[model samples]
Target chain A: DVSGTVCLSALPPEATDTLNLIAADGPFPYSQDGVVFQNRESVLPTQSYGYYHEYTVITPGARTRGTRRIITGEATQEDYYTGDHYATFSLIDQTC
Target chain B: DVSGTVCLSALPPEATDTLNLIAADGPFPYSQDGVVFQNRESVLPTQSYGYYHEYTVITPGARTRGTRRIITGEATQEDYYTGDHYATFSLIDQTC
Candidate 1:
């Protein structure tokens, strides 16, 4: 079995102060029981886009070989103080 | 004629960092000449929600007297740095 990691970056803000990372394709096999992700405030300040953020997904171990698995990212802002902004990201696996 | 603007607070984040407070009901009246609003970052920070924000709508000149007036709030996050957060608020006037 082959093991690897997937990384997604540049997620848009949301209507709320929470961001969601979803699995879009077949269940990817990982040694880790649960997936982990990280993000930070934008280093730059602009009215059009608030800050910039990044994400990473790692697969621990694989019991079976799979060729198709997808992961998606969804993000939202904090409050009315922020504004109407939204964005999404996708990850696709082609190798087993 | 009686004229005034409404106030709404605690809006949710969106996909973008910008927050939008829209007029929901009839146009209110004020003497300021133009509508003005204000907001500040949250004094406290937590994972559930980001900073707590506030808003106030001030109408300009009063052309007529009317009772039904409304305002709505729409917010979006900045980037993946934020999250999949979203929220909305409304302002309503019963008196003219």
Candidate 2:
């Protein structure tokens, strides 16, 4: 389990927006938005490939795809927010 | 279980070469060779994402990455061969 908790309401507006898009199955802004996230870094729990998909969390000022992202797990419906790409993550707890 | 069995010795030379590359963790020819395979088609039995990875099986006359492929399952060390891009698969039976 992840050490930190991020209440869904506490997420960045961009991440919340991404969540809404995920819930709707997306007409995503980034063509790469809904693709499988290869958890090569192993920061997250071990899971089968295609178990997770990533969404971009648009950086307010960064022109690039920026480091922030929202990763969603298909089997458990778990969501994780990563502000530094895949280096670290906080579980996005909807019940909080 | 997949109905068809493809003996390892009967695999295309390219597929056997691809198997060696995969065994070596790849200095693969295609950039996308070792990426996670999202089994969206449901032709293969359901598995978690990242459970399967795909490698290209070179075609003799095709210029682009041809329709042939080798799919590997992580949890079971199962290998599958697809001649028509994932529309169907034959288990690569090393024992055969």
Candidate 3:
């Protein structure tokens, strides 16, 4: 059985691009990108204010910023990917 | 200025009505009513799965269910009201 983590390479290329932007401190595509992500869906573990930040993963041809996202934890440097908005999430495992 | 809590009498009549429906085991208006509230916004304290449930507070004339909601905690019967969807929440205190 697979672990709860998703390998970094397994994610879509746009997701990787988003992750790169997070590392370089973007110039993000959407204004909503790099905002404090309120983990209201409760799928992600709770953290204090500003602990989790959100970034947009651009879809190829979607008119709007589509549902895909990369939520990063400031303290842990951990990344979580959510394709279906915030309904579900998978930890992005870089080491895998 | 007000405390962090909102008094029961101070809430909208529809909110109180929803509370009553909750007390009577519900004949909720919206089909989505009474679903598990994720507390994803992390405005409320965290608890186990199924700890919080949501109910729609009917808007006066809006065609849709609107943003108003009453999120009730199963263990405490404590209520949280969110007028602007879940952006902000005020604990509903019956005693206040």
Candidate 4:
């Protein structure tokens, strides 16, 4: 898949925080944070409607949270990701 | 007004970046970033279409651009803000 291993080192520290939050599944900042990701771009591996859910990544020094994110599939490990505010994506496995 | 006095101090540094970009009419990062907000939420002072536009808030350390945003009115200084991806919003003016 073009959405290959999203290296841990490559991701910023804020992304690491988001990943942990996703693992815990608690205390999410926003109501829209964990909603269905409706992959309209059709780039990632397509599945059912509920197959994808998205989360926000905090943009440092931003007026708002900023346009970065990580999406998880049916399972936490089955994580898919996007750094460019949904313009692009990758698999969220640190180790290939 | 409730959505008032978005102090510059309250805003993170990234928000300032967005404001500058908006002022420049930006070479924005994502295609979806600068689209019309179509504020169905109806919280802000009512205005006509094209009165508002939305931009992504770059979530720090995020795998993607996070769910934070700055929604500005027709006038650049006349801006509204949302940290929770549009679940709610505020006005981004330091002075009241």
DockQ of each candidate, alpha-carbon based: 0.01, 0.01, 0.02, 0.12
- Tell me, by lDDT, which candidate is best: 2
Per-residue error at A33 for model 2, in Å? 37
Worst 10 residues of 1 chain B by lDDT: B1-10
lDDT of 4 by residue, A13-62 (tens): 87788888887985787556898977655666788997988888877675
Q: RMSD in Å for candidate 4, one decimal?
A: 12.1
Which one wins on DockQ? 4
TM-score of each: 0.15, 0.48, 0.49, 0.49
- Clashing residue pairs, backbone N/CA/C < 3 A, model 2: A48-B49, A48-B50, A49-B49, A49-B50, A49-B51, A50-B49, A50-B50, A51-B49
- For residues A12-91, write the lDDT of model 1, one tens digit per residue: 23211122332233232333212222212221222232223322232123122111122222333211111112122232
How big is the positional error of residue A25 in model 1, measured in Å on the Cα after superposition? 10
lDDT of 4 by residue, B6-90 (tens): 5654566777788778889898877887898887877666789878889976667788777678888876478766766676565
lDDT of 1 by residue, B1-96 (tens): 001111122112220112232222223233321222122232112223222232223212334422112222233321111111112222222121
* Per-residue lDDT of model 2, residues A1-96, tens digit only: 343555665555687788889899888999999889999978778899988889998877688999889999875659988876676677787775
Which CAPRI tier for candidate 1? Answer: incorrect
For model 3, residues A1-96, the per-residue Cα lDDT tens digits are 111466676566787899889888998888899999887756678778788899998877678898889989875548888766776676787765
Interface C-alpha RMSD after superposing true interface residues, each candidate, one decimal: 18.7, 18.4, 13.5, 10.7
